[PDB]
Design a protein around this ligand. Sequence first.
Ligand SMILES: [Cl-]
Ligand SMILES: [Cl-]
Lengths: 589, 589
Amino acid sequence: ADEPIALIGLSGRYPDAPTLEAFWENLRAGRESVREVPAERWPLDAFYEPDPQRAVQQGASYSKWGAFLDDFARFDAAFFGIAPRDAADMDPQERLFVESAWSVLEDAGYTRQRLAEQHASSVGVFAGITKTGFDRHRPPAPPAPRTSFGSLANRVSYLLDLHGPSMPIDTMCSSSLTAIHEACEHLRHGACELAIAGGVNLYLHPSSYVELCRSRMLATDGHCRSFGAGGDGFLPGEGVGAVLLKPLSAAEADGDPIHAVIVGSAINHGGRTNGYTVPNPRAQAALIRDALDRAGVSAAGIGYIEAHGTGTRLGDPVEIDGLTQAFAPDGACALGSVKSNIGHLEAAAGIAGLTKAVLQLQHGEFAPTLHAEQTNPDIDFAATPFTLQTGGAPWPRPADGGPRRAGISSFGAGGANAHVIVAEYRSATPAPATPAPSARPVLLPLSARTTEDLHARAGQLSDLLRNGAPVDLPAVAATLQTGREEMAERVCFVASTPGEWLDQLGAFLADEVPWSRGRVRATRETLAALAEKDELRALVTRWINRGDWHDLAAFWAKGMPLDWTRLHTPARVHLPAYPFAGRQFWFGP
Amino acid sequence: ADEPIALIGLSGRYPDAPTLEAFWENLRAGRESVREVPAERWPLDAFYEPDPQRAVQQGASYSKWGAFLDDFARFDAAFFGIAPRDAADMDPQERLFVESAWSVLEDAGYTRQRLAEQHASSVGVFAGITKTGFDRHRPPAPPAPRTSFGSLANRVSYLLDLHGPSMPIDTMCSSSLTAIHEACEHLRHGACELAIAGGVNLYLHPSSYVELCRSRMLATDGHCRSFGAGGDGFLPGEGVGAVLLKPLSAAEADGDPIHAVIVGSAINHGGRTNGYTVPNPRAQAALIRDALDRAGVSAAGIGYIEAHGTGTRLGDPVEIDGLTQAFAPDGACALGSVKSNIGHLEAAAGIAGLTKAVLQLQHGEFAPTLHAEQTNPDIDFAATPFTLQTGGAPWPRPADGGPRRAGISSFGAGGANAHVIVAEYRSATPAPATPAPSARPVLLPLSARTTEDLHARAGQLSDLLRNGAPVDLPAVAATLQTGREEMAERVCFVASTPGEWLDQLGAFLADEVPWSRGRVRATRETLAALAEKDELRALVTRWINRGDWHDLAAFWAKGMPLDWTRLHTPARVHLPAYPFAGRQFWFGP
Ligand SMILES: [Cl-]
Ligand SMILES: [Cl-]
């Protein structure tokens, strides 16, 4: 009852994790990124009140902790042609999500031009967000801080020239997972050919904590003891994440690089319960059952549940109640929650959970769940089809022979629920050539907006070659050529082996030379007109025929356009996204 | 490329229009509901600055006008079991939309029970909203004003026990029209069996005007001269509106009352333009063409365009540019904008435009467009397929013999666009019985939460019988019986003709008597247990067989359950929705 949606682009920043590499390593190490509220956010002087009961009175907060995001206020405005003044006025949540949105494009190997020519720019944007408070800031001269849920999505669609549906998704705690679901639906029904979905969550004003405290939803100890004993409330967590989605059918045909596959998803509402924020286990069951059927998968086909897992006394047993009811017709299924690592990201909780699930699928490992040494007294997993993953362990292939599958749940405080089933992506791969692939010379073009960015890009690729990620030069070359935009500061390499390229990159970073360097400050139209000169056309044709790759490389580095299809199309691969290192835009505490 | 979605429920409140009857009469009369900012909103002392240039400096507003909504802060909290304290803290936008959401249910003739039994409560909620500012208020003791886009939808899903998708829609100026589109999509794809979609727009804080002024988007004269000469900016307008939607296939089968049919709709984004808020005529063309094709209708099949029509110098010609490009392959098509009547409702602009379009379709008339005596100099409609409807005129059936169709456009400031094509609903109706329908006695049950509400309900029905709306008693009876919830204060009539019923209602409002009055303060379960007594069952059966209708009426009025199917199912009709007259919840200026 559903068509598979390929996940071809993935980006994210999380507490103590500027990259997904760091994020996975933290998860693998069972790291908790809890921290007292940074001085730059707001002073704890008239904010923190140790006693929970006295805190609700006089409008304070009994929580001083939180998992915060580094460089939350940092934004490369110049990159997006945004004036410093305007950037200062837009919510940091929106700034971070723009960079994230660019990053998923690069990760997937899509340029703005390729989106236009190949998909008519029909790319939808569904951006999860629920947190406000940036409005409350009143900075000195006139500055006008503003949060626009619409702008979050629409500005992305603007800057990237996307013509698909563009809207925020605010279902509170389940926003980003609702967004990921809606994106999939629009793709299954042809509303758009690609879709960016994600979420962002920042705590910019102390009033956020005060409000969360008034409802007694924050943990008094500052932890998310998901399904652990002494479950109080949750720990506020920050983060940005996005995915680029496309129907598996189209992705495989277009040779897109595929992280994983969303095989089924669902959303609903709990309806009338005893209270406005009282969860409905019956609804959660129907929710997950719905997703299961659309994926055409029995509950016994799920290897891991990334649970909502807020870490509250009555909340966690309800979630397991709903899970048991859903898995009842179809035990020991691995269960945990990223909340125990980085807290509650609310709007960004879904994308964070999904990201962890994908990383688990890809690495074939279970990340431990923290604060579960003593399981919540009101739950015994022995009577459930589930088993709390307190420790790290390998994720073996199912006995079926099928794919690994994970279920991710996200439950909104207002009763809006979401569930996404994600499967490992497997495909027939031919045996490797022995003892190595063919050593043919390829052009490896590299560009960035500034020299500092250029060196950062090269640094990223050096780390890529060294950190054991599967690398075949021609695929990397093709992605650099057709999956990256041509920018002003350029360097182009010619190499036949990764070893040779790594040697070159090392030399370049430390600085005749084994590369062509160039600065191209010219319109595409001007450079095109030059390239159309007959003798210049003749030069390129000659160089290609005689295999003068270093001349072609020099030509490109100086600004000349090359028809890359003439130089051989291998499938594209995931290469490091733009190393944003923008300015800081923050009013202050 | 689309399935028809029936519009079976319609509700709305607009400036100088507490009911849609008043709204249509205002539109018919060419009335403008412009007004200076009410004292209860905010003082104009440190707010209004006559000079536009000096106003942007020192953070003021050069607009003092606006189309405002009566009883914006009024809310029947008791009706929804909401404590006065909590109601005070929720955004008036959310309060008004709850009442609206209940009203569309009653208009469509749906109870909460019928939704559950017949559709498993799979009703989606898509609520348009973009305006914030309620947060800015800091009332005395602790009160905490809050705007939650998620709650807007989720609270409705809660109170009404709905289990479908529940989310706000914020695409800025096009919110409600985006919401109506998304609702339709979810219905076409089986995401839910019914859907509530709508929008709300209030100006609760003066900062709203200040921000709109900074971008020079407000009119200096306080008018929406849509496609008229001297087009400045727009006039801020308030309003609440909602629709209840269901696939035409299901609606006709279930005998639902049908206002009109949404035959096609579309959304997109302008992409990269010269500025973030600079409209894309090319995108608007593709948008409308998209909707046209999904409806399977040529542009020559459209009788009226309800244009976005902000009333700006360069904005209006762009809209017509996009309209001409769209209508180019497939002149004099009627065109206008409700903006000229009630200003710019932004989030609620779409639903307001749609509502006007439906009222035009139903009455078969064109409402005039105001401030168009001098057409915008940069446009001549003579070269366009369109003609600006400056005056009121009948809307004749198309020469094709087909249905009347209207196109409604709504363009967001962030570049998110929406277009909905709406068609007249026509169906084979048998010739009326002469000289009158059969005069058989029917039970006409009436109930409300209080006596004041009960008398208000009866007043509504009296007006209904007198104002020439088509009335056949058995249909009205059936809707009162199965399309209204049974509440505490009850009165039940037995009548055979509308004349007789009207006589009774008149007597009742002025007060043996020709009705049974009752107050039922009891659980359904308690009353059910009584009704199950054998001799009581026997009584009802006897009464039905002997046709003792006044005894049955007395029985129901005293709290006894009647199986209404035993008393005859005619199709339901639109009866007046609950006459909400709640308390006022407003912090102050
Ligand atoms: Cl350099
Ligand atoms: Cl009375």
